[PDB]
């Protein structure tokens, strides 16, 4: 080649990766053919060779790993200390040149740095000298007073955004005037926590025209930095006089703190890492990429919780303190819960909180009467039931608290009739929760059947590649066996569904976002943090397009949706839940656009009302065609002769999921009952190439389609009728047949019994309960009515109009969205301003009240008025048993978002389970968390308001006396929660304020605090109170002392100097420096932790060190000696360090 020389064997082979001669030991690289420089150990140990070939004499030579050898003339390597070009270098006994290595060599203490270059460990490495922080101006800039008055503060603490009142204002930069009350200025104008930040602040403000055209750094002198700040101050004050405002300064101070910068490498780094998320590192396993747990500390007395509160992870499975599987042989008993989900996690193991949760439930259940007392119909605008949200992320005690309430208020334990008038539901995703619910929790709330959901998806909704057999519907792991469901009051009461506002929607969108912009959002979990409205609009045009496509070309969305809904709505022993987004489009105006499936599904829904009743049986023939039969009311098997009600009731369903179904000579059979022999049947739903046909009466059917049962009550189908299809709505075949001659009076539903029941379950899976149906009446991605939206865009108005629609569909429980005024801060999907769905809120009692000026100010769904009217219209609708349509409140006890006020709290960095991510610098440190509510919100009005009232009631005695499982204590209604505070929270997601956002003197190592004059906090910087103040290192006949920028002395702390070396200062206020009498290896603080301190005082880090005896130790990033441990080196070298701390010796 050219500029490359390569060699091949006396053979086909290239000879990559080994040494070979020609006429000179040329190494050739294992990947590149190319001849490289290398060091060969063959023959005499340690020979060295260059690219051209031939031995290296008297020169440096570098290894494939990166090891640097030095040879003498004659080719032998050198070891020990060597002077190469008037520079000392250390070579170990392996001949490697080494960096970050300290030791006494030939009676000289040397430290070889990152270079490899020796420094004298005798010579001081810091600037000798102090620098006064007293100026002509310090008298004027000193604080007006040293207490809460004169500082903006978080519980007494100061942050980087603290503003203060100085004694004088340099007014229009020309005249020192006494300061008025409103003359506050940002602390960062006159004080900084070290020189580096000071330097950066100066460059930044100068970049806004308020500064010097000169670049500064931490390397720059202290006195220059101070003088330059004064020039900036003149500029600031003139601008303030010009603008008649300081808001501009607040803006530019805030943006400085989060400013980014170039680096040496050339990338964007944070200018102030300790004031941003960058410094908040730990585990990523939390939806928002980090979490804190709040933990008590003496420094922060009012953020501290009581003893034995903050019990994390009391999921139904672990309510006791330990996992308990309630599941039996076929079923799973896993728990996938975890305490810290999103936002600020409410502590529901605190009994005062638990009472506040009860209060809230009472409020919702009486929302109408409470909010509109003057209105004589207030009593008709009350909620009826609740949906418990995020059950696996809150203390399970709450399930019992609620169960107790509804027994107390509505006597739901008495009979089916009362129970079924208030139908609650759990968001209980863990498998174990089904059985916990049954054994521990009565069935006070309805479990979800997840086995049904997952099977409907696997067997029908998947593409053909991934799709399960229909035979799976007759499997054993299913919660409710329906192969021969011929009884009542056996099945575990449950609600079953296919999609929901979150499940099987938001993840399909996030996948699309990710498959278009992997650059920005590489995973689906990450994509849920997407906040740009552009990204959703884009994704949705795709999603909507995909839904219109044929089944074989559905790249993103669910196949066979009407086939699935047909099984779900005809199934026995379940309360079905319909998702809004399967009738209507998940995006756009509320109820404005229908899906491809609206016809099919709304047919089924009314049909259910007329025919679906009696016993059930599932089958799947050799061809894998599912045939589900309902025998009609009064008949529980195929061999049952039934009641008078049987003849004209009882549906039958046929489903295949094979698009190339060819029956050939085979036959499909719907075995209706012997109660249905010699009987004419007609289709409700059928599949063409064009789509699905829906016949809505007998008279819409053509006579040839009619078909009559034989003497056994069977229907038989040919290949002429049933083949494979591939439409938008069906891969495989779908058919629904109903008996001919039904009347308009005919209703298949059953009235609830008023008899007392045996056992502990509130609900019982029987005919009456199966007469119920839930409609999830919202979507995440419903468009958000713009500021000046017309009154009829708001979903709660549209609900009221269409009230009868839902009654016609058989709806008995209308599950509304959460109605709580949403955050718009984009911290998570639910809080982005384009989908303020109502799961992200600050004020749990605010369901859309008018503003203070009395202007209508609604939620996404409408005003409080509009909500009250939605509930009245639904209540005004009456179902088959004469009772109203129930309205369901989404009960969201897990968290709060986006709280207005900061509080000081003690934090530990953790993951979502609460497990300490063990970052050293985040161990019970002080954080300014947005964790306190306004105290003027509706929480402050209604919080705990009804608890005194409720205690006095006899009916609630059980509730209040009940011993809760996890707390082992009873609920505590005696304290009211009107302001949320940190003490009522388990923890929070990481808020990116930065570790060092709360300000602190580094010499004393105490926090500043202006609300206290206790000795656990440091007094204000000495200059900010017009006292003498100096900073720097000062050498003395005794030793070395150090004063911080604030003027205090270093005692019992480590101290980093000029982004370089670390040092330690003892109890006497003196630097620690090893002497000849007392060597370098030293405990310093009664911690069992050993450091390596040079005679400079330099405490070495990421570096090896030596005894005078000859042993080697390694000291980690924190400077601590390493024990019982392997250490990998830069050049891929390995060293083992014994429990001893000493290195294990090598020699080869
Ligand atoms: Ca929680």
Distance 365 CA to ligand 1 centre (A): 23
Q: What is the rounded CA–CA span in Å between residue 198 and residue 206?
A: 12
Q: How many residues does the chain have?
A: 1148
> 424: Cβ–Cβ under 8 A, 6 or more apart, which residues?
385, 386, 387, 388, 402, 406, 444, 445, 446, 888
What are the phi and psi torsion angles at 566 (to 5°)? -65, -45
Distance 893 CA to ligand 1 centre (A): 8
**How many other C-beta atoms are found inside a 10 Å radius of the C-beta of residue 836?**
22
Question: Considering 897, 931, 960, which residue would you say is the last residue of a domain?
Answer: 897
Q: What is the rounded CA–CA span in Å between residue 697 and residue 607?
A: 10
Handedness of CA 927, 930, 935, 940 (dihedral sign): negative
Distance 347 CA to ligand 1 centre (A): 6
> 1014: Cβ–Cβ under 8 A, 6 or more apart, which residues?
none
H or E stretch at 90 = strand 88-91
Distance 402 CA to ligand 1 centre (A): 17
Q: Measure Cα distances from 828 to 224, 546, 824 in Å.
A: 45, 26, 10
Strands 385-388 and 886-891: parallel
Q: What is the rounded CA–CA span in Å between residue 617 and residue 636?
A: 9
- Over the range 564-587, which residues count as b (16 or more CB within 10 Å of their CB) and which as e? bbbbbbbbbbbbbbbbbbbbbbbb
The conformation of residue 468, written as its DSSP 8-state character, comes to P
Q: Which pairs count as long-range contacts for 693-701, CB under 8 Å and 24+ apart, including other chains?
A: 694/599, 694/600, 694/603, 696/603, 696/606, 698/740, 698/741, 698/742
Give start and end residues of each alpha helix (H) in 441-553.
Answer: 450-456, 506-516, 524-527, 533-548
Q: What is the rounded CA–CA span in Å between residue 166 and residue 227?
A: 18
Distance 258 CA to ligand 1 centre (A): 30
H or E stretch at 241 = helix 222-243
Nearest to 309 by CA among 291, 296, 322, 297: 296
> 668: Cβ–Cβ under 8 A, 6 or more apart, which residues?
621, 623, 625, 627, 654, 716, 717, 722
- Per DSSP, the three-state class of 118 is strand
Distance 886 CA to ligand 1 centre (A): 28
The CATH number assigned to the domain holding 531 equals 3.20.20.470
Are 214 and 334 in a shared domain? no
Supply 537's token pair.
Answer: 């609009």
Are 603 and 624 in a shared domain? no
Distance 356 CA to ligand 1 centre (A): 15
Are 483 and 586 in a shared domain? yes
The conformation of residue 377, written as its DSSP 8-state character, comes to T
Distance 352 CA to ligand 1 centre (A): 15
How many domains would you assign to the chain? 5
H or E stretch at 566 = helix 561-570
Distance 318 CA to ligand 1 centre (A): 13
Distance 283 CA to ligand 1 centre (A): 18
Q: Are 307 and 350 in contact (CB under 8 A)?
A: no
CA 1093-1099-1105 angle, to 5 degrees, is: 60
Which residues does a chain break follow in the chain (C to N more than 2.5 Å)? 23
Burial bucket for residue 212 (CB in 10 Å: 0-12, 13-18, 19+): middle
> Tokens 């003359």 label which residue?
183
Distance 848 CA to ligand 1 centre (A): 25
Distance 834 CA to ligand 1 centre (A): 26
Distance 288 CA to ligand 1 centre (A): 15
**How many other C-beta atoms are found inside a 10 Å radius of the C-beta of residue 598?**
15
Burial bucket for residue 1051 (CB in 10 Å: 0-12, 13-18, 19+): middle
Are 934 and 1033 in a shared domain? no
SS (H, E, C) 475-501: CCCCCCCCCCCCCCCCCCCEEEECCCC
Residue 381: HSE in the Cβ half-sphere, 13 Å Cα cutoff: 20
Are 217 and 359 in a shared domain? no
Are 682 and 781 in a shared domain? no
Supply 620's token pair.
Answer: 């799947």
Distance 353 CA to ligand 1 centre (A): 12
Are 957 and 1007 in a shared domain? no
Show the beta-strand stretches assigned E in 151-194: 163-164, 168-171, 175-178, 185-186
Distance 508 CA to ligand 1 centre (A): 26
Are 206 and 222 in a shared domain? yes
**How many other C-beta atoms are found inside a 10 Å radius of the C-beta of residue 1068?**
12
Question: Considering 994, 1017, 1045, which residue would you say is the last residue of a domain?
Answer: 994
Q: What is the rounded CA–CA span in Å between residue 716 and residue 667?
A: 6
Are 451 and 543 in a shared domain? yes
Range of the domain at 1090: 1-133+1028-1148
Are 859 and 906 in a shared domain? no
Give the residues across from 1113 on adjacent strands.
1105
Question: Considering 831, 865, 897, which residue would you say is the last residue of a domain?
Answer: 897
Are 186 and 332 in a shared domain? no
Give start and end residues of each alpha helix (H) in 822-887.
Answer: 864-876
For the chain, count helices (H), then strands (E). Answer: 23, 56
Q: Are 724 and 660 in contact (CB under 8 A)?
A: yes
Q: What is the rounded CA–CA span in Å between residue 889 and residue 819?
A: 8
Supply 846's token pair.
Answer: 């605010």
What are the phi and psi torsion angles at 383 (to 5°)? -65, 165
Nearest to 796 by CA among 861, 703, 700, 868: 861
H or E stretch at 32 = none
Q: What is the rounded CA–CA span in Å between residue 776 and residue 814?
A: 7
Distance 887 CA to ligand 1 centre (A): 26
- Per DSSP, the three-state class of 376 is coil
Distance 396 CA to ligand 1 centre (A): 10
Show the beta-strand stretches assigned E in 771-822: 774-776, 813-815
Experimentally determined by: X-ray
Distance 344 CA to ligand 1 centre (A): 8
Q: Are 998 and 159 in contact (CB under 8 A)?
A: yes
Are 339 and 354 in a shared domain? no
Distance 310 CA to ligand 1 centre (A): 10
Q: Measure Cα distances from 405 to 411, 956, 992 in Å.
A: 9, 7, 40
Distance 337 CA to ligand 1 centre (A): 10
Distance 162 CA to ligand 1 centre (A): 32
The conformation of residue 591, written as its DSSP 8-state character, comes to T
- Per DSSP, the three-state class of 1131 is coil
Q: What is the rounded CA–CA span in Å between residue 387 and residue 378?
A: 23
Burial bucket for residue 638 (CB in 10 Å: 0-12, 13-18, 19+): buried
- First-to-last alpha carbon distance for the chain, in angstroms, is 38
Distance 340 CA to ligand 1 centre (A): 5
Supply 831's token pair.
Answer: 């809080």
The CATH number assigned to the domain holding 700 equals 2.60.40.1180
The CA-based dihedral angle spanning residues 114, 116, 122, 126, taken in that order and rounded to the nearest 10 degrees? -30
Distance 895 CA to ligand 1 centre (A): 6
- Per DSSP, the three-state class of 159 is strand
């Amino acid at each position: 080649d050219n500029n490359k020389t390569q060699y091949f064997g006396p053979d086909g082979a290239q000879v990559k990766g080994a040494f070979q001669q020609v006429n000179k030991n040329i190494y050739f690289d294992a990947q590149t053919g190319y001849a490289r420089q290398n060091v060969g150990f063959l023959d005499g140990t340690a020979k060295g060779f260059d690219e051209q070939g031939n031995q290296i004499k008297s020169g440096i030579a570098t290894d494939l790993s990166g090891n640097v050898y030095y040879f003498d003339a004659s080719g032998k390597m050198l070891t020990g200390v060597q002077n190469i070009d008037g520079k000392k270098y250390y070579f170990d006994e392996q001949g490697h040149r080494r960096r970050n290595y300290a030791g006494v060599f030939n009676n000289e203490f040397i430290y070889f740095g990152l270079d490899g270059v020796g420094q004298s460990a005798i010579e001081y490495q810091f600037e000798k000298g102090l620098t006064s922080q007293n100026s002509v101006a310090t008298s004027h800039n000193a604080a007006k007073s040293y207490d809460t008055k004169s500082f903006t503060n978080v519980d007494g603490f100061l942050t980087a955004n603290s503003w203060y009142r100085p004694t004088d204002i340099l007014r229009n930069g020309t005249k020192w005037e006494p300061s008025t009350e409103t003359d506050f200025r940002p602390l960062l104008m006159t004080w900084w926590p070290d020189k580096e930040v000071q330097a950066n602040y100066l460059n930044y403000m100068s970049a806004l025209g308020l500064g010097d055209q000169k670049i500064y750094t931490g390397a720059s002198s202290q006195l220059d930095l101070n003088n330059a700040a004064l020039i900036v101050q003149e500029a600031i004050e003139k601008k303030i006089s010009l603008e008649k405002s300081t808001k501009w300064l607040d803006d530019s101070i805030k943006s400085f703190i989060k400013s980014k910068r170039k680096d040496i490498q050339g990338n964007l780094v944070d200018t102030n890492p300790g004031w941003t998320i960058d410094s908040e590192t730990g585990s990523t396993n939390h939806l928002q990429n980090g979490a804190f747990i709040f933990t008590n500390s003496p420094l922060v007395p009012e953020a501290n919780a009581a003893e034995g509160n903050r019990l994390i992870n009391r999921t139904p499975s672990q309510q006791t303190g330990n996992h308990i599987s309630y599941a039996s042989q076929p079923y799973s008993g896993d728990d996938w819960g975890y305490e810290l989900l999103l936002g600020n996690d409410v502590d529901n193991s605190n009994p005062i909180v638990q009472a506040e949760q009860l209060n809230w439930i009472h409020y919702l259940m009486n929302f109408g009467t409470i909010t509109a007392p003057q209105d004589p119909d207030a009593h008709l605008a009350n909620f009826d039931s609740i949906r418990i949200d995020a059950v696996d992320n809150v203390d399970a005690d709450l399930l019992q608290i609620a169960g107790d309430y509804f027994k107390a208020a509505y006597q739901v334990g008495e009979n089916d009739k009362n129970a079924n008038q208030h139908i609650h539901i759990l968001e209980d995703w863990s498998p174990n929760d089904v059985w916990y619910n049954q054994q521990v929790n009565g069935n006070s709330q309805l479990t979800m059947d997840a086995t049904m959901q997952n099977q409907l998806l696997a067997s029908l909704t998947r593409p053909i590649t991934s799709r399960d057999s229909m035979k799976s519907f007759t499997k054993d792991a299913l919660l409710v066996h329906r192969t021969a469901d011929n009884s009542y009051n056996q099945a575990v009461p449950n609600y079953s569904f296919i999609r929901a506002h979150d499940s099987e929607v938001q993840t399909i969108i996030a996948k699309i976002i990710s498959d278009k912009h992997p650059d920005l959002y590489p995973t689906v979990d990450k994509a849920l943090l997407a906040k740009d409205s552009a990204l959703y609009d884009e994704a949705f045009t795709e999603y909507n397009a995909d839904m219109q496509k044929i089944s074989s070309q559905k790249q993103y969305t669910h196949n066979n949706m009407p086939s699935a809904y047909a099984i779900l709505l005809t199934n026995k022993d379940t309360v079905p839940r319909v998702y809004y987004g399967d009738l209507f489009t998940d995006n756009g105006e509320y109820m404005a656009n229908k899906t491809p499936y609206y016809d099919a599904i709304t047919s089924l829904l009314t049909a259910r009302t007329k025919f679906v009743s009696g016993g059930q049986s599932l089958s799947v023939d050799k061809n894998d065609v599912l045939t589900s039969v309902r025998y009609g009311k009064g008949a529980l098997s195929a061999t049952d002769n039934g009641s008078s009600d049987t003849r004209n009731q009882g549906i039958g369903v046929i489903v295949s999921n094979n698009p190339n179904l060819d029956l050939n000579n085979d036959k499909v059979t719907l075995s209706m009952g012997i109660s249905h022999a010699h009987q004419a049947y007609r289709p409700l739903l059928l599949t063409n190439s064009q789509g699905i046909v829906a016949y809505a009466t007998d008279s819409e059917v053509p006579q040839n389609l009619y078909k009559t049962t034989n003497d056994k009550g069977e229907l038989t189908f040919d290949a002429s009728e049933i083949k494979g299809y591939d439409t938008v709505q069906t891969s495989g075949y779908l058919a629904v047949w109903v008996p001919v001659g039904a009347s308009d009076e005919q209703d298949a539903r059953t009235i609830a019994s008023t008899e007392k029941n045996n056992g502990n379950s509130v609900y019982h899976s029987n005919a009456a309960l199966d007469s119920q149906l839930i409609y999830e009446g919202f979507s995440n991605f419903q468009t958000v009515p713009s500021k000046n939206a017309s009154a009829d865009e708001y979903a709660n108005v549209i609900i009221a109009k269409h009230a009868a629609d839902f009654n016609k569909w058989g709806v008995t429980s209308f599950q509304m969205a959460p109605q709580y005024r949403s955050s718009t801060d984009g911290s998570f999907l639910d809080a982005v301003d384009t989908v303020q769905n109502g799961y992200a809120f600050t004020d749990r009692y605010d369901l859309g009240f008018n503003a203070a000026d009395g202007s209508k100010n609604p939620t996404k769904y409408g005003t409080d008025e509009d909500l009250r009217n939605a509930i009245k219209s639904l209540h005004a609708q009456k179902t088959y048993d004469g009772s109203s349509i129930q309205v369901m409140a989404d009960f969201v006890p897990d968290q709060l978002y986006n709280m207005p006020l900061e509080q000081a709290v003690s934090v530990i960095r953790t993951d979502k389970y609460g497990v300490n991510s063990e970052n050293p610098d985040i161990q019970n440190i002080i954080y300014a968390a947005n964790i306190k509510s306004s105290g003027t919100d509706y929480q402050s009005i209604y919080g705990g308001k009804y608890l005194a009232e409720l205690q006095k009631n006899p009916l609630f005695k059980s509730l209040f006396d009940r011993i809760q499982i996890s707390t082992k204590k009873t609920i505590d209604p005696n304290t009211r929660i009107t302001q949320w505070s940190a003490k009522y929270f388990n923890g929070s997601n990481i808020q990116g304020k930065g570790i060092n956002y709360v300000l602190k003197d580094w010499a004393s190592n105490k926090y500043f605090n202006v609300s206290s004059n206790d000795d656990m906090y440091s007094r204000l910087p000495k200059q900010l109170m017009n006292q003498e103040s100096n900073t720097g290192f000062i050498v003395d006949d005794i030793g070395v002392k150090y004063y911080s920028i604030s003027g205090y002395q270093a005692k019992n702390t480590f101290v980093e100097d000029g982004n370089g070396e670390w040092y330690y200062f003892d109890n006497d206020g003196y630097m620690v420096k090893s002497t000849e009498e007392s060597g370098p290896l030293r405990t310093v603080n009664a911690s069992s932790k050993k450091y390596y301190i040079l005679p400079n005082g330099v405490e070495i880090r990421n570096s090896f060190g030596q005894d005078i005896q000859g042993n080697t130790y390694y000291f980690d990033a924190r400077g601590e000696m390493v024990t019982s441990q392997y250490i990998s080196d830069d050049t891929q070298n390995i060293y083992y360090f014994n429990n001893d701390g000493t290195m294990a010796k090598k020699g080869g």
